[PDB]
Ligand binder design. Structure first.
Ligand SMILES: NC(=O)c1ccc[n+]([C@@H]2O[C@H](COP(=O)([O-])OP(=O)(O)OC[C@H]3O[C@@H](n4cnc5c(N)ncnc54)[C@H](OP(=O)(O)O)[C@@H]3O)[C@@H](O)[C@H]2O)c1
Ligand SMILES: CCc1nc(N)nc(N)c1OCCCOc1ccccc1CCC(=O)NS(C)(=O)=O
Length: 167
């Protein structure tokens, strides 16, 4: 369903291991080129919001991510994010009619209360939670959605898509 242009739809999009781990050591601890396609179709043409550490983690060749207004949250007023804009709190990050929050653990948690969509890729990889991991936010009982079927990636890694929504 289309978003009325006077409203403010906030979505979260992430990929996680079964354990909920999304990030470790400044990176994502798997590679899934198929997940990149889904990420692009959801976010293309909209504003994307990310934490400063997620900006740092982006491959240099796609930083800023093309075809999307890139917004970076930082408390560092002098932060350099070429091709993007830096905001110092959530207030001015969510003023577009459609915004996708693209990570990381801190900024998913910050934006979750305002979100009405989550697009979640689950990767069937056994990565037990460790000290310092970035984690998927916990979804409360207001959320509902659909669980997709497992598929193998070319590499043999298994993954499936969840699409969640709430009012
Ligand atoms: N699997 C996935 O789908 C996925 C997607 C994205 C990222 N990741 C991974 O997630 C990890 C990064 O997550 P993370 O939790 O460490 O960091 P993050 O959420 O990306 O960034 C945290 C930074 O955001 C800024 N920030 C946080 N809250 C703020 C607020 N209220 N106001 C202003 N600025 C705020 C601060 O920047 P300053 O320190 O500059 O003040 C903070 O250090 C990486 O491993 C990355 O690869 C995974
Ligand atoms: C695909 C990962 C991902 N996956 C999901 N599902 N949600 C996220 N937030 C999400 O994170 C998006 C931000 C981090 O992006 C990374 C991380 C590691 C390696 C590469 C990229 C960039 C991928 C890329 O080129 N994207 S594109 C084609 O130009 O639009």
């Amino acid at each position: 369903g289309l978003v009325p242009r006077g409203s403010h739809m906030v979505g979260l999009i992430w990929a996680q291991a079964t354990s909920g781990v999304i990030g470790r050591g400044g990176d994502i601890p798997w590679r899934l080129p198929e997940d990149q396609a889904h990420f692009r179709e959801i976010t293309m043409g909209h504003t994307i919001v990310m934490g400063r550490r997620t900006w740092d983690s982006l491959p240099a060749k796609v930083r800023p991510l093309p075809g999307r207004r890139n917004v970076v949250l930082s408390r560092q007023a002098d932060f350099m994010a070429s091709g993007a804009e830096v905001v110092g709190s959530l207030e001015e990050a969510l003023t577009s009619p459609e915004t996708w929050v693209i990570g990381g653990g801190q900024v998913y948690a910050l934006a979750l209360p305002y979100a009405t969509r989550c697009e979640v890729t689950e990767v069937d990889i056994g990565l037990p939670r460790e000290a310092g991991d970035a984690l998927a936010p916990v979804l409360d009982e207001t959320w509902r959605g659909e669980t997709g079927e497992w598929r193998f990636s070319r590499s043999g890694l298994r993954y499936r898509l969840y699409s969640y929504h709430r009012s």
